[model samples]
Target: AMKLINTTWTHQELVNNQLDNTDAFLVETYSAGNTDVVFTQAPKHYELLISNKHRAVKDNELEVIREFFLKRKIDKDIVLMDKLRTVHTDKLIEISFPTTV
Candidate 1:
């Protein structure tokens, strides 16, 4: 059995997390081959929730996310969760990004 520790994302870490999010969006567990993974848009959302929070989608993190998917050539439906904490999707073959609040 595996255990997840008290993992949380910082503003920067949220960007880092975006990379993984892109990969997961494009690739699946079978393709990654049993590698450990996690999903979280909550922290990122929280960061966004704060007024004057980071915006620019083309920020370092957004670039990372874009690059990640471009490199993998994994093009799929990607949507931003409306005013939630993370990205979200309903595609059975794909995973949601996170919901925003």
Candidate 2:
């Protein structure tokens, strides 16, 4: 005897449906952009990504980094894909401090 399988649906459609899974949950999850930069001229959903460097971030000073990114400091080590522009927004919102290294 031979077995039969359904082949009506495309692979792409099946793969797209897999996104419904939540995967996991968190008590205080910060995973959305718009930390400070509110661009009215560009798209609303997309955020302006910026590059940053860690000159010397102490292990216990994670909040300082978060604050820097949150406040969008001018002197903060920023790297915009290699082009450091004078941006007012840090473009980061989600962050979990005091992580175990």
Candidate 3:
């Protein structure tokens, strides 16, 4: 059977569909010079592919990597199909932090 292609994917979609799929690879747009990119988790490629890389993420470090991508420190080694996004509008929102002594 043929695989799937997508323009966008959410964090939940990554977790539920792609992250744990041994047969699937996280694929994205190739060497196009545009500022934006495309994304999909599938077994292989389409026509315009030009960029690719993936890592041996830890079994328990999914959340860590997710946070890294969100932070973008290393890009945080961004997963943007190479991943990362979030959140809601507010009447009022909550925030908290740890104590430092």
The TM-score between candidate 3 and the true structure equals 0.17
Model 1: CA > 4 A from native: 1-58, 75-101
Shift in Å, residue 96, candidate 3: 26
Instruction: Locate the minimum summed-lDDT window of 10 residues in model 1.
Output: 44-53
lDDT of 3 at 59: 25
List the candidates' TM-scores in order: 0.20, 0.17, 0.17
Candidate 3: which stretches are off by over 4 Å? Answer: 1-59, 73-101
The local distance difference test score of model 1 is 0.30
Error of 3 at 78 (Å): 16
Q: Which of 1 and 2 is the better model by TM-score?
A: 1
lDDT of 3 at 84: 22
Tens-place lDDT digits, model 2, residues 1-101: 21122221433343333323422111111211211111111111112222224233232333443444436422223323233233332422233222111
Q: How well is each residue in 19-87 modelled by candidate 3, as lDDT tens digits?
A: 366433443321112212233333332111112233332323334323332353222222233212221
Best by TM-score: 1
